[PDB]
Protein backbone atom coordinates (compact mmCIF):
# COMPACT_ATOMS: atom_id res chain seq x y z
CA UNK A 1 0.00 0.00 0.00
CA UNK A 2 3.08 2.21 -0.10
CA UNK A 3 2.38 2.87 -3.79
CA UNK A 4 -0.03 1.09 -6.18
CA UNK A 5 -0.65 -1.36 -3.34
CA UNK A 6 -4.16 -1.97 -4.70
CA UNK A 7 -3.29 -2.03 -8.40
CA UNK A 8 -4.56 -5.61 -8.51
CA UNK A 9 -7.20 -5.22 -5.82
CA UNK A 10 -10.88 -4.37 -6.27
CA UNK A 11 -11.97 -0.94 -7.45
CA UNK A 12 -13.60 -0.49 -4.04
CA UNK A 13 -10.47 -1.28 -2.05
CA UNK A 14 -8.42 0.82 -4.47
CA UNK A 15 -10.90 3.63 -3.89
CA UNK A 16 -10.20 3.39 -0.15
CA UNK A 17 -6.56 4.51 -0.62
CA UNK A 18 -6.21 6.61 -3.77
CA UNK A 19 -4.58 9.49 -1.97
CA UNK A 20 -1.28 7.66 -1.89
CA UNK A 21 -1.15 7.15 -5.56
CA UNK A 22 -1.78 10.84 -6.11
CA UNK A 23 0.83 12.04 -3.64
CA UNK A 24 3.89 10.31 -5.04
CA UNK A 25 3.49 10.95 -8.77
CA UNK A 26 4.01 14.72 -9.00
CA UNK A 27 6.73 14.79 -6.34
CA UNK A 28 8.45 11.54 -7.29
CA UNK A 29 11.77 10.92 -8.97
CA UNK A 30 14.02 12.98 -6.73
CA UNK A 31 14.37 15.53 -9.51
CA UNK A 32 15.38 18.20 -7.12
CA UNK A 33 18.95 16.90 -7.11
CA UNK A 34 35.21 19.61 -15.88
CA UNK A 35 33.01 22.66 -15.33
CA UNK A 36 30.25 22.29 -17.94
CA UNK A 37 26.67 21.18 -17.25
CA UNK A 38 25.65 20.47 -20.87
CA UNK A 39 25.85 16.69 -20.46
CA UNK A 40 23.50 14.08 -21.93
CA UNK A 41 22.12 13.29 -18.46
CA UNK A 42 21.17 16.86 -17.58
CA UNK A 43 19.16 17.30 -20.78
CA UNK A 44 17.37 14.01 -20.14
CA UNK A 45 16.73 15.23 -16.59
CA UNK A 46 15.22 18.57 -17.62
CA UNK A 47 12.79 17.24 -20.23
CA UNK A 48 11.85 14.39 -17.90
CA UNK A 49 11.01 17.11 -15.35
CA UNK A 50 9.01 19.10 -17.93
CA UNK A 51 6.57 16.30 -18.76
CA UNK A 52 6.43 15.67 -15.00
CA UNK A 53 4.58 18.93 -14.51
CA UNK A 54 3.05 19.09 -17.97
CA UNK A 55 1.31 15.74 -17.48
CA UNK A 56 0.30 16.64 -13.93
CA UNK A 57 -1.03 20.03 -15.06
CA UNK A 58 -2.69 18.36 -18.04
CA UNK A 59 -4.84 16.41 -15.56
CA UNK A 60 -5.24 19.11 -12.89
CA UNK A 61 -6.67 21.44 -15.55
CA UNK A 62 -9.56 18.99 -16.02
CA UNK A 63 -10.57 18.75 -12.35
CA UNK A 64 -10.61 22.54 -12.06
CA UNK A 65 -13.37 22.86 -14.66
CA UNK A 66 -15.29 20.08 -12.88
CA UNK A 67 -15.60 21.72 -9.46
CA UNK A 68 -12.90 19.42 -8.09
CA UNK A 69 -10.05 21.86 -7.52
CA UNK A 70 -9.07 20.29 -4.21
CA UNK A 71 -11.04 17.07 -3.89
CA UNK A 72 -9.85 13.58 -4.79
CA UNK A 73 -13.46 12.37 -5.25
CA UNK A 74 -16.25 14.54 -6.67
CA UNK A 75 -19.72 13.18 -7.20
CA UNK A 76 -20.81 14.87 -10.41
CA UNK A 77 -24.38 15.78 -11.43
CA UNK A 78 -24.04 14.08 -14.86
CA UNK A 79 -26.42 11.13 -15.42
CA UNK A 80 -24.89 7.82 -16.45
CA UNK A 81 -25.85 6.51 -19.89
CA UNK A 82 -26.72 2.82 -20.04
CA UNK A 83 -24.84 2.35 -23.32
CA UNK A 84 -21.50 2.88 -21.55
CA UNK A 85 -21.94 -0.16 -19.30
CA UNK A 86 -24.82 -2.54 -18.55
CA UNK A 87 -23.49 -3.91 -15.24
CA UNK A 88 -25.30 -3.31 -11.95
CA UNK A 89 -24.14 -1.53 -8.78
CA UNK A 90 -22.30 -4.39 -7.07
CA UNK A 91 -21.42 -6.08 -10.38
CA UNK A 92 -18.40 -3.90 -11.24
CA UNK A 93 -17.23 -2.55 -7.88
CA UNK A 94 -16.90 -6.03 -6.33
CA UNK A 95 -15.41 -7.74 -9.39
CA UNK A 96 -13.18 -5.56 -11.61
CA UNK A 97 -9.80 -3.98 -11.09
CA UNK A 98 -9.34 -0.42 -12.23
CA UNK A 99 -7.17 -1.85 -15.01
CA UNK A 100 -10.10 -3.76 -16.51
CA UNK A 101 -12.39 -0.74 -16.21
CA UNK A 102 -9.91 1.57 -17.95
CA UNK A 103 -10.12 -0.53 -21.14
CA UNK A 104 -13.91 -0.86 -20.88
CA UNK A 105 -14.51 2.91 -21.11
CA UNK A 106 -11.41 3.85 -23.14
CA UNK A 107 -13.64 3.74 -26.23
CA UNK A 108 -16.19 6.31 -25.01
CA UNK A 109 -14.03 7.98 -22.36
CA UNK A 110 -13.83 11.25 -24.30
CA UNK A 111 -17.62 11.40 -24.64
CA UNK A 112 -17.87 11.49 -20.85
CA UNK A 113 -15.32 14.29 -20.46
CA UNK A 114 -17.09 16.66 -22.84
CA UNK A 115 -20.37 16.18 -21.02
CA UNK A 116 -18.81 16.65 -17.58
CA UNK A 117 -17.79 20.24 -18.33
CA UNK A 118 -21.30 21.18 -19.48
CA UNK A 119 -23.62 20.12 -16.64
CA UNK A 120 -21.29 20.30 -13.62
CA UNK A 121 -19.68 23.65 -14.51
CA UNK A 122 -20.93 25.23 -17.75
CA UNK A 123 -24.49 25.23 -16.35
CA UNK A 124 -23.93 25.06 -12.58
CA UNK A 125 -21.79 28.20 -12.33
CA UNK A 126 -24.44 29.86 -14.52
CA UNK A 127 -27.40 28.78 -12.38
CA UNK A 128 -26.33 31.35 -9.79
CA UNK A 129 -27.38 34.26 -12.03
CA UNK A 130 -30.85 34.17 -10.47
CA UNK A 131 -29.69 32.95 -7.04
CA UNK A 132 -26.52 34.90 -6.19
CA UNK A 133 -28.24 38.19 -5.33
CA UNK A 134 -32.03 38.36 -5.43
Amino acid sequence: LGFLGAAGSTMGAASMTLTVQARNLLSGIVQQQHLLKLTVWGIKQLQARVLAVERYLRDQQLLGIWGCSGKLICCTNVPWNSSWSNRNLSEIWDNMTWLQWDKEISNYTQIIYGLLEESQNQQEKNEQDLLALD
Epitope: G12, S90, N95
Partner: nanobody, 131 residues
Protein backbone atom coordinates in the same frame (compact mmCIF):
# COMPACT_ATOMS: atom_id res chain seq x y z
CA UNK B 1 -18.00 -15.21 -18.06
CA UNK B 2 -15.53 -18.00 -17.32
CA UNK B 3 -16.45 -21.53 -18.39
CA UNK B 4 -15.87 -24.28 -15.84
CA UNK B 5 -15.88 -27.94 -16.91
CA UNK B 6 -15.72 -31.05 -14.73
CA UNK B 7 -13.92 -34.32 -15.42
CA UNK B 8 -16.91 -36.61 -15.12
CA UNK B 9 -17.73 -40.30 -15.33
CA UNK B 10 -15.74 -41.88 -12.53
CA UNK B 11 -17.25 -44.65 -10.41
CA UNK B 12 -15.89 -47.19 -7.94
CA UNK B 13 -16.96 -49.54 -5.14
CA UNK B 14 -18.66 -48.29 -1.95
CA UNK B 15 -15.60 -48.62 0.29
CA UNK B 16 -13.32 -46.91 -2.23
CA UNK B 17 -11.97 -43.35 -2.46
CA UNK B 18 -11.97 -41.41 -5.74
CA UNK B 19 -11.01 -37.85 -6.66
CA UNK B 20 -12.80 -35.58 -9.12
CA UNK B 21 -11.28 -32.68 -11.05
CA UNK B 22 -12.47 -29.48 -12.72
CA UNK B 23 -10.86 -27.63 -15.62
CA UNK B 24 -11.12 -23.84 -15.41
CA UNK B 25 -10.81 -21.36 -18.26
CA UNK B 26 -11.72 -17.75 -18.96
CA UNK B 27 -11.44 -16.23 -15.48
CA UNK B 28 -8.74 -15.36 -12.97
CA UNK B 29 -8.36 -18.47 -10.82
CA UNK B 30 -6.64 -16.74 -7.89
CA UNK B 31 -9.52 -15.12 -5.99
CA UNK B 32 -12.76 -16.68 -7.25
CA UNK B 33 -13.58 -19.43 -4.77
CA UNK B 34 -14.46 -23.03 -5.63
CA UNK B 35 -17.20 -25.02 -3.91
CA UNK B 36 -19.04 -28.29 -4.44
CA UNK B 37 -22.58 -29.62 -4.09
CA UNK B 38 -24.36 -32.95 -4.52
CA UNK B 39 -27.90 -34.08 -5.37
CA UNK B 40 -28.85 -37.47 -3.96
CA UNK B 41 -31.70 -39.83 -4.75
CA UNK B 42 -33.31 -37.59 -2.14
CA UNK B 43 -35.04 -34.47 -3.40
CA UNK B 44 -32.62 -31.92 -1.95
CA UNK B 45 -29.11 -31.18 -3.16
CA UNK B 46 -26.80 -30.08 -0.36
CA UNK B 47 -23.67 -27.92 -0.22
CA UNK B 48 -20.18 -29.21 0.57
CA UNK B 49 -17.16 -27.00 1.20
CA UNK B 50 -15.68 -23.87 -0.35
CA UNK B 51 -11.96 -23.54 -1.07
CA UNK B 52 -9.95 -20.40 -1.78
CA UNK B 53 -7.13 -20.85 -4.34
CA UNK B 54 -5.20 -18.15 -2.45
CA UNK B 55 -4.19 -18.53 1.22
CA UNK B 56 -6.02 -21.88 1.31
CA UNK B 57 -8.20 -20.86 4.26
CA UNK B 58 -11.29 -23.03 3.87
CA UNK B 59 -14.45 -23.80 5.84
CA UNK B 60 -15.88 -27.16 4.77
CA UNK B 61 -19.16 -28.61 5.99
CA UNK B 62 -19.09 -29.95 9.57
CA UNK B 63 -20.57 -33.32 8.57
CA UNK B 64 -17.87 -33.84 5.91
CA UNK B 65 -14.85 -32.10 7.49
CA UNK B 66 -13.93 -35.41 9.15
CA UNK B 67 -13.97 -37.58 6.00
CA UNK B 68 -13.83 -35.33 2.91
CA UNK B 69 -10.91 -32.96 2.38
CA UNK B 70 -10.02 -31.05 -0.78
CA UNK B 71 -6.99 -29.09 -2.01
CA UNK B 72 -6.14 -27.04 -5.09
CA UNK B 73 -2.87 -26.22 -6.84
CA UNK B 74 -1.77 -22.88 -8.32
CA UNK B 75 -2.60 -21.51 -11.78
CA UNK B 76 -0.93 -20.68 -15.10
CA UNK B 77 -1.73 -17.14 -16.32
CA UNK B 78 -2.89 -16.86 -19.91
CA UNK B 79 -3.05 -13.06 -19.99
CA UNK B 80 -3.39 -10.33 -17.36
CA UNK B 81 -7.06 -11.16 -16.75
CA UNK B 82 -7.68 -14.69 -18.11
CA UNK B 83 -6.14 -17.84 -16.66
CA UNK B 84 -6.66 -21.59 -16.45
CA UNK B 85 -6.45 -23.64 -13.27
CA UNK B 86 -7.67 -26.87 -11.70
CA UNK B 87 -9.40 -27.92 -8.47
CA UNK B 88 -9.51 -31.42 -6.98
CA UNK B 89 -11.24 -33.07 -4.04
CA UNK B 90 -10.80 -36.39 -2.23
CA UNK B 91 -13.49 -38.27 -0.31
CA UNK B 92 -12.55 -41.16 1.98
CA UNK B 93 -15.82 -42.96 2.82
CA UNK B 94 -19.07 -43.23 0.88
CA UNK B 95 -22.09 -45.50 0.56
CA UNK B 96 -25.21 -45.88 -1.56
CA UNK B 97 -26.40 -42.72 0.22
CA UNK B 98 -23.42 -40.89 -1.34
CA UNK B 99 -24.34 -41.85 -4.90
CA UNK B 100 -25.60 -39.24 -7.34
CA UNK B 101 -24.43 -36.32 -9.45
CA UNK B 102 -21.72 -33.90 -8.29
CA UNK B 103 -21.12 -30.34 -9.46
CA UNK B 104 -18.46 -27.70 -8.99
CA UNK B 105 -19.04 -24.00 -9.49
CA UNK B 106 -17.18 -20.71 -9.62
CA UNK B 107 -17.34 -18.42 -6.61
CA UNK B 108 -19.87 -15.61 -6.87
CA UNK B 109 -17.78 -12.46 -6.51
CA UNK B 110 -14.47 -11.34 -5.04
CA UNK B 111 -15.54 -9.10 -2.20
CA UNK B 112 -17.19 -9.08 1.19
CA UNK B 113 -20.99 -9.17 1.52
CA UNK B 114 -21.15 -12.58 -0.24
CA UNK B 115 -18.54 -14.68 -2.05
CA UNK B 116 -18.94 -18.22 -0.88
CA UNK B 117 -22.01 -18.99 -2.99
CA UNK B 118 -21.52 -20.40 -6.52
CA UNK B 119 -21.84 -18.53 -9.80
CA UNK B 120 -20.99 -20.33 -13.05
CA UNK B 121 -21.55 -24.08 -13.05
CA UNK B 122 -19.90 -26.88 -14.98
CA UNK B 123 -21.45 -29.69 -16.97
CA UNK B 124 -21.19 -31.91 -13.89
CA UNK B 125 -20.09 -35.41 -12.89
CA UNK B 126 -22.38 -38.29 -11.93
CA UNK B 127 -21.07 -40.95 -9.54
CA UNK B 128 -22.65 -44.39 -9.02
CA UNK B 129 -21.84 -46.00 -5.67
CA UNK B 130 -23.59 -49.25 -6.62
CA UNK B 131 -21.64 -52.37 -5.68
Amino acid sequence: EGQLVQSGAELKKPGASVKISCKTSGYRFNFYHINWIRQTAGRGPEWMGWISPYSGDKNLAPAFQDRVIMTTDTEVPVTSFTSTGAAYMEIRNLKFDDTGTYFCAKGLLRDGSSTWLPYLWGQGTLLTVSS
